[PDB]
Design an enzyme around this catalytic site. Sequence first.
Site, short mmCIF file in Angstrom:
data_model
loop_
_atom_site.label_atom_id
_atom_site.label_comp_id
_atom_site.label_asym_id
_atom_site.label_seq_id
_atom_site.Cartn_x
_atom_site.Cartn_y
_atom_site.Cartn_z
N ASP C 312 8.69 84.44 3.94
CA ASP C 312 9.62 83.38 4.31
C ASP C 312 10.92 83.49 3.53
OD1 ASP C 312 7.86 82.41 6.16
OD2 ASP C 312 7.28 80.62 5.03
N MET C 342 26.16 66.08 -10.81
CA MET C 342 26.07 66.93 -9.63
C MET C 342 27.30 67.82 -9.49
SD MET C 342 23.16 66.61 -8.25
CE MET C 342 23.49 67.47 -6.71
N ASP C 361 38.30 64.37 -10.81
CA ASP C 361 37.71 63.04 -10.91
C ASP C 361 38.85 62.04 -11.01
OD1 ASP C 361 36.15 60.66 -11.99
OD2 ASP C 361 34.53 62.14 -11.84
N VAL C 418 30.37 62.48 -4.77
CA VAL C 418 30.57 61.13 -5.30
C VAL C 418 29.39 60.26 -4.88
CG1 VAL C 418 33.06 61.47 -5.18
CG2 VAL C 418 31.89 60.26 -3.33
N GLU C 420 26.86 57.81 -2.97
CA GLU C 420 26.38 57.84 -1.59
C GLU C 420 26.83 56.57 -0.87
OE1 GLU C 420 24.71 60.50 -0.46
OE2 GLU C 420 23.49 59.91 1.26
N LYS C 425 33.25 57.87 0.66
CA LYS C 425 33.46 59.27 1.02
C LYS C 425 34.64 59.43 1.97
CE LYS C 425 28.59 60.59 0.42
NZ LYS C 425 28.72 61.59 -0.69
N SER C 447 22.84 63.00 0.62
CA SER C 447 21.39 63.05 0.67
C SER C 447 20.80 62.43 1.94
CB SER C 447 20.79 62.34 -0.55
OG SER C 447 21.17 60.97 -0.59
N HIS C 468 24.19 70.04 0.53
CA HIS C 468 23.37 69.18 -0.31
C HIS C 468 22.74 70.01 -1.43
CE1 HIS C 468 19.65 66.39 -0.79
NE2 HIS C 468 20.60 66.06 -1.65
#
Lengths: 402, 402, 726
Positions: C312, C342, C361, C418, C420, C425, C447, C468
């Site tokens: 796989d 992240m 940022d 940033v 969720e 966003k 996510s 992701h």
Amino acid sequence: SEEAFIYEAIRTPRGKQKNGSLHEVKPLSLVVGLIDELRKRHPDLDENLISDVILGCVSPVGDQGGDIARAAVLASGMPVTSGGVQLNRFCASGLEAVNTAAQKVRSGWDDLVLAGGVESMSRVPMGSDGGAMGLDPATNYDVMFVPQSIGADLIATIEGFSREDVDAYALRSQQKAAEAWSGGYFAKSVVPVRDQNGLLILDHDEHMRPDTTKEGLAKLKPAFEGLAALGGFDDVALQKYHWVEKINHVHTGGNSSGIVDGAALVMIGSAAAGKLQGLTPRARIVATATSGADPVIMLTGPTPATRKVLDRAGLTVDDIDLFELNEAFASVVLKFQKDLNIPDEKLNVNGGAIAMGHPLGATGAMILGTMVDELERRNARRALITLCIGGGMGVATIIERV
Amino acid sequence: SEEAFIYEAIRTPRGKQKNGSLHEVKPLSLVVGLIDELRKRHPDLDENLISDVILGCVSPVGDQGGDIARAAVLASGMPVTSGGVQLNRFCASGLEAVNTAAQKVRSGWDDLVLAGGVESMSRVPMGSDGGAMGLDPATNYDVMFVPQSIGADLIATIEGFSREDVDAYALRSQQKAAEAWSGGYFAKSVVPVRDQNGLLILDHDEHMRPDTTKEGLAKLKPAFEGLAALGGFDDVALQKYHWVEKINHVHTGGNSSGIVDGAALVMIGSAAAGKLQGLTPRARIVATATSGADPVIMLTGPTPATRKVLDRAGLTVDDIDLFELNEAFASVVLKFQKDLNIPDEKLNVNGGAIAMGHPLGATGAMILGTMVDELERRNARRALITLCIGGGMGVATIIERV
Amino acid sequence: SSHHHHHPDNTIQWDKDADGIVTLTMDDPSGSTNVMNEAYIESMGKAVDRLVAEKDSITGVVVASAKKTFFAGGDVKTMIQARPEDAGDVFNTVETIKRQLRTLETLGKPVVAAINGAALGGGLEIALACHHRIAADVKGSQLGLPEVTLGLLPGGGGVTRTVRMFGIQNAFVSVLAQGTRFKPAKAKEIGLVDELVATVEELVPAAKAWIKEELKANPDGAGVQPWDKKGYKMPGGTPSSPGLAAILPSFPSNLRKQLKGAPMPAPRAILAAAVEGAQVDFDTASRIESRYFASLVTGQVAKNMMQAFFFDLQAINAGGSRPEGIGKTPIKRIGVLGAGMMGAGIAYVSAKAGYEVVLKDVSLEAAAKGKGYSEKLEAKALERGRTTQERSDALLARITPTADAADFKGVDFVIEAVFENQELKHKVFGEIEDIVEPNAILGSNTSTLPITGLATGVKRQEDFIGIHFFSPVDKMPLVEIIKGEKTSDEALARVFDYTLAIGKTPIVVNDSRGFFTSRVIGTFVNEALAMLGEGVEPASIEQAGSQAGYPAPPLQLSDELNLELMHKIAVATRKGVEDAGGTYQPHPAEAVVEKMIELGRSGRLKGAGFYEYADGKRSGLWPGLRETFKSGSSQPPLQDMIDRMLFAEALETQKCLDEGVLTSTADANIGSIMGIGFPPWTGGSAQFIVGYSGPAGTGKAAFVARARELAAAYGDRFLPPESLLS
């Protein structure tokens, strides 16, 4: 249907592990000394009627290898027809030898047998013989091997025995053993160890600490020596006991059994054998039982073994006057007492291995003899003797004063 | 008065010492394999009724230390209440375990017991456990320790057994073992040893030399390896046997037992235990006896042990159909036959350890099982099993086909 | 016996020079790498026969390779087909391989391995049969015995020889238990190789030079391994030594501690073979090793792990989910939006791969802390000798922190990381949409929020796509790529190629709320919370998770996931169902989530969840948990608890396949292992179904029967989808 009776039960004093008085004494000599004492008590005993000598020994290597029981028969000048066999059922080996001797008497094929044990832990350390349960990875992994001290801590965690609870029992053990020694309870059965010149080597249980205080016990550190100090064993225990989050490590050197040297001997025979030899029976072996529990917690075997021997004899807890359980760890005794609802005043009334020491292969025969004396001293009727065993086994024996 | 019955008796093939098939097999695995075979024969057997597992083991160290019997109970998935104890009465340990199991059944305190032995001599050599009778000078000196092969040569010297006499018996042992194997006598009780993949490791007694000739045996040299090759031992033996001028060294590797690996297992229980489990009894343990003779000559224990077990059962030599005596040395068998006037056709009818090997702690249980099969095959009644033991001990057992 | 399998092209070239040194140059004409296939065994068998036949004219042997690598692994295609009835053939095969190496090892003359490239598995085992190992210190060269990662063990003498070389403890912990791969310089330090040369051209000359010097300096010991000499002492002792015997009982317990009780048989087999082999002679040890190898290859776990970690993984790395036909596009400058853990990790792996990174940022100090994440990792790597100062400075120099949107000029690949939140966003992307390059990738580290809705906040929705990552980004190898409804194939290919460039493993997911990983891992944690609400002990729930094989127990994971996030997910799930005209049925876990939120214990970030927290450390389960949910009143078997968690994810995985969320079982298996933490012994949440082994049997049919058993006892959510039925 041939009843087995106890005619004699003696033991050496227990010498300590560090700078101990018995470190210079070969374990064979410990057994021969007790044989000489039995011969000294019954000089006209026809030794040709003794058909076997059965010794428990947990580390039968080196000084304790090569069937030490047969070596003792030959070294002591006993008849060559007197047999000699070594057995190992871990900490219960001394009581197993006694039970096996009683079952040989009941079979009618043996009439008079010597049973006991010997262990010189200062000369032959625990684990000297090896073994697959610990040293073979496939066996160790599958059986989920865990050192006994961690099983003892897991018991205290599951049952809610605090560090002060186990230290309170250890204090009582020191006090009861001191009162028994000062009261003369042990004068008739503890045989002083002497050298080839008759010079005294040891005449008392030198592991005892009669000045133990509750404050002193609280300062001791949890067990951090041996296999317990190694890694992973807590995780293994909790993988089986998955509802327990964390093990409370309450056991120390002060609430666990001492490492000591010693031997014990018991003479067991039928009624016709004793009557032929002018021997007076001291107690009768009522029933024996072998059972066991989970080997990971390891130290909970005494409870199912005790229930089985009580059902075999048709008795209940209330029918037993004295309970004797080896004090390998304080929580094991508290667990056994909680399981069966045993009153404090019936349990290890003369102290135990926390004060006096635990000479593996001999202990079962020592505490058996301790109960023969205490039943006679109190003029009581029945005693139940049991020990926790590695691998989760359990053995229990009921005796009745005669 | 609770009769003990044999319900199953099996064994592994015996793997040789040099380039042996069983050298890669842990001795624990040998026992577990036989447990799996018993479980395979009685899958619905309530194993909770098994109260003990008793294994003889002469060198209980390393792979064989730490109570291998309890390791086998746990590794095989037997219930934790099934016990586990190791015993050592030298070469008789396997039969002692069987006798002890039968006496536990007669006592009424155990109902169903597994008994047997295990010995991996290629992995755990003889003498690996040490011992005081040999290694302690004071004990060795006083007991007049002598290696067993010199006692065997002294027997041949005293009784007048020539080198051709012992080589003639060895030839008969090779022939009888070959006829038993080719005749299918061993097909039901010799359990092939397989690996974890089910691949065959060993399915036959690879120590056998079926092409042995009288001329080939005559060319072999007297035993000159081990402790016998050391000095002083002839002098020690003749100091006790002072009427013998010189020892005739007649025993070789070809008329003595082979060094081999193997295990054996026997299931013993009461009548009610077998009836509750749908088991058919194969034989009944009639009587057991422990005796002994001089430890210097060492190998004359079988005679007084046999006389004692016959008197216990109220029988004579003529009442026994088959005599099985372990073939540690050829002269020991000839001596036993001369002592009791045993016909040749009753003695070791399927060959013995000279052909197939002597796996110390297991042998007593192997030849016990061999006699259970041969009594059933001949539809004969009684067999007497006995072995010579180090230190001069002797053990004998009478079984009766059921 | 024989050096041949029974009684195939030639893969070994023979050359004997005038001095008598034979060079065996391995060069399999059928593949790009030397493998332990049928042709190798026959070729090596003939070469070893010739070494014996010409032994009078041979003074030394050099084992070399003509390929880019030395020798890489065995033949997985054959091993995966081995059934239990084939155990004899498997045993005979590895015995034959090792008979060849043992003859080579005992020729009475020195044999040197010239390791020019990677030597993994059977390749290293060949070099271990030699008396001297020289390795070229070239980049990309790896040495090790990674058989354990396929559920196997080094069955060509790797266990036996490493234990003879290093002892039981060092060989197991450092080489065998985890299949650790070593760089040539790292391998020389532990003694796996003996000397290094700068270039591959120096190897064979250095091998012959060492042979020539060995015959002159050590004539009596030439060609004799240490364990074949009288008086050999195993490092650390044998199992009978008192020193080793004192610690030997802790080796299986330490193993169970690291594995947490998961049913993975290969590490247990390796330790058993290692210790049992140390008790006997070499030839007996080798045969014991063969029996344990055969036990693993014919077992189901090895078939799961060979399918996942070999086949796989290979199909994915070959581009199975990549759009067909589309060419490559270089990435000139990457822009990361958000300097949290992240985004800081995303900037690290991107710069480590050689890309220029702008880390943005809302605070310059915050953006600098993000780059400091990479600084601390490089200081750790520099201190362990895993990189050089020059290479480390170039990595960090490629990270430029900023708080100004104008610094995104020239960025052609944006990765937003940033909070969720859709409205957040939207405004974050709208700030830089006109500043970055026209055809720039607009990637979102999301996510659960569907990519189609996020893409509406940008003008070029064809370039918007979900990228992701998984924390910690520097150690997690999966990138979950989610295609929005308007995401172009050209954009998918560019992110696919970026994932391979940073050394990670991509899976391609179609737009759906929860995607694949978040949706499936949600059924895992929700199943644990349902058990807590039923009254199951919290400790048993955590043990069931660890013994199933998950890297973190589910209650600990729930605290990290933040129960406020889990509550918002359940709200969004409910909204989606009833907006589509359906009836929402809440998972039993939602009442547990709501209760913990009401109590103010919403997870680790708040400082209180199912566990207590102090000094930034987790400090045991909350003692009030047992009274809140009546813990202990429900005591199901541990295996039922384990099966409830495993089956929940396996059933959910099948639903994702049925719905088109996933397009291949390879993506389902690797995605579940690398992203969801699905236990590697299963081979993946899809392989778990076909490879299921339980009391009911094996296979898909047994999986369905056990699923229906769990359904009758614990709820209809365990009923299998229609695609699993006959």
